[PDB]
Paper text:
We observed a substantial increase in RRM solubility after RNA binding and were thus able to use untagged [name] incubated with selected RNA ligands for structural studies of the complex. This allowed us to perform a comprehensive and comparative analysis of [name] interaction with three distinct RNA ligands: AUUUA motif-containing (AU6tnf), a U-rich motif with sparsely distributed adenosine residues (AU15) and a poly-U motif (U6). In the case of AU15, electron density for seven nucleotides (UUUAUUU) could be fitted. While in the structure of [name] with U6 and AU15, a uridine is recognized, in the case of AU6tnf RNA, an adenosine is bound in this pocket. In [name]-AU6tnf and -AU15, the ribose in position 1 forms a (water-mediated) hydrogen bond with the main chain carbonyl of Lys285. On the 3′ end of the RNA, nucleotides in positions 5 and 6 are closer to the [name] β2β3 loop in case of the U6 ligand than when AU15 or AU6tnf are bound. To summarize, the core of the RNA interactions with [name] is formed by three binding pockets with canonical aromatic residues from RNP2 and RNP1 (Phe247, Tyr249, Phe289) that recognize a U–U–U/A RNA sequence motif. The affected area correlates best with the dimeric interface found between chains A and B in the structures of RNA-bound [name] suggesting this is the dimerization interface in solution. Moreover, our crystal structures of RNA-bound [name], together with NMR experiments indicate that the dimerization interface is formed by stacking of Trp261 and hydrogen bonds between amino acids from helix α1 and the α1–β2 loop.
[name]/[name] is an RNA-binding protein involved in differentiation and stress response that acts primarily by stabilizing messenger RNA (mRNA) targets. [name] specifically recognizes adenine and uridine-rich elements (ARE) and uridine-rich sequences in 3′ untranslated regions (3′UTRs) of mRNAs. Hu/ELAV proteins share a common protein architecture with two consecutive [name], separated from the third RRM ([name]) by a less conserved, flexible hinge region of variable length. Here, we report crystal structures of [name] [name] free and bound to U- and AU-rich RNAs.
Numbering used by the authors:
A (entry chain A): 240 to 323
B (entry chain B): 242 to 322
Write the structure that this text describes.
Amino acid sequence: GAMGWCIFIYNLGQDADEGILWQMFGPFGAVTNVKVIRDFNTNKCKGFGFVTMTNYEEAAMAIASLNGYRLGDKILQVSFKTNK
Amino acid sequence: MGWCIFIYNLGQDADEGILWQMFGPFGAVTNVKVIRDFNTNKCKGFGFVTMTNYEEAAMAIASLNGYRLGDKILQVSFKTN
RNA sequence: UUUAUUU
């Protein structure tokens, strides 16, 4: 719908930035927003972020390819965002 | 803040209650956490306690290291970087 | 075997 679908990415590095998210997700389809969550005191990435994709089937393709992807030396976890 | 204490060789079913019961008697404790596998939610075998007072943390460590928890011998120490 | 897990 209008909100799109929100994807949660875990196991980003301390120097990860929005550019790394756009680059990873952009290829699978329309991406409308990205955000890296950063540590209040250090300004480093706390290790996770969010990407909003418009179309469910493109979001599902992204998650299938990127969940388990090795970025630097860490195995990413990616899935649709849950509440909290 | 306080002094962070590392506890290794916790079993799968270990929880915060067991850590509170062990370390509580030695002095002020402000946090306990058991580390769990994100998927299975089973304790991965270690946890942490934060105690406020350096000398009380020392006493807990010297007293509890080698403590037998179920079938397992615990390793307790000041947390390393 | 030394805690970033959902803005």
